[PDB]
Design a protein around this ligand. Structure first.
Ligand SMILES: [Ca+2]
Ligand SMILES: [Ca+2]
Ligand SMILES: [Ca+2]
Ligand SMILES: [Ca+2]
Lengths: 89, 89
């Protein structure tokens, strides 16, 4: 319940909010991932369909069409680095 | 200001809350990192001095005694994976 735990908890809750909708409840399908990106991230709302499709491919490291929690965490890490760098310039 | 952005923002704010105290304002010294671990994470409060010292070494990937944002993000990723796995069992 400490500050960092709560932040991490939010990240985890958002993943499952979308991953549990269809197919494997533990992975994000293209549809689930696109919705998560568009509704949960500011940059997601700025991206156009073509850009999102390519971004999702890059996130799908093992190219199995699904984004598991590990792949999602990698995405979060990248977003955090971008965030830190921006708030730095 | 969207949900995932806020979670990421919290992660970033916590880093700087401690990193800006001494030396390089952009990196966490051993002292700053130990305080962050002990006060911002539940598991941090459970760890004893010896365990924390070793954990900090592992987080310091390039072994320069400081933990930069990138190294901190790696730590966060690991914590997120642990969190997800625990809330799964
Ligand atoms: Ca799913
Ligand atoms: Ca995958
Ligand atoms: Ca510092
Ligand atoms: Ca380092």
């Amino acid at each position: 319940a400490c500050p960092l735990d709560q932040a991490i908890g939010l990240l985890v809750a958002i993943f499952h909010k979308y991953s549990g909708r269809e197919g494997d409840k533990h992975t994000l399908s293209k549809k689930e991932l696109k919705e998560l990106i568009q509704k949960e991230l500011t940059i997601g709302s700025k991206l156009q369909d073509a850009e999102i499709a390519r971004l999702m491919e890059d996130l799908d490291r093992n190219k199995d069409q699904e984004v598991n929690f590990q792949e999602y965490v990698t995405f979060l890490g990248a977003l955090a680095l971008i965030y830190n760098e921006a708030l730095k310039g």
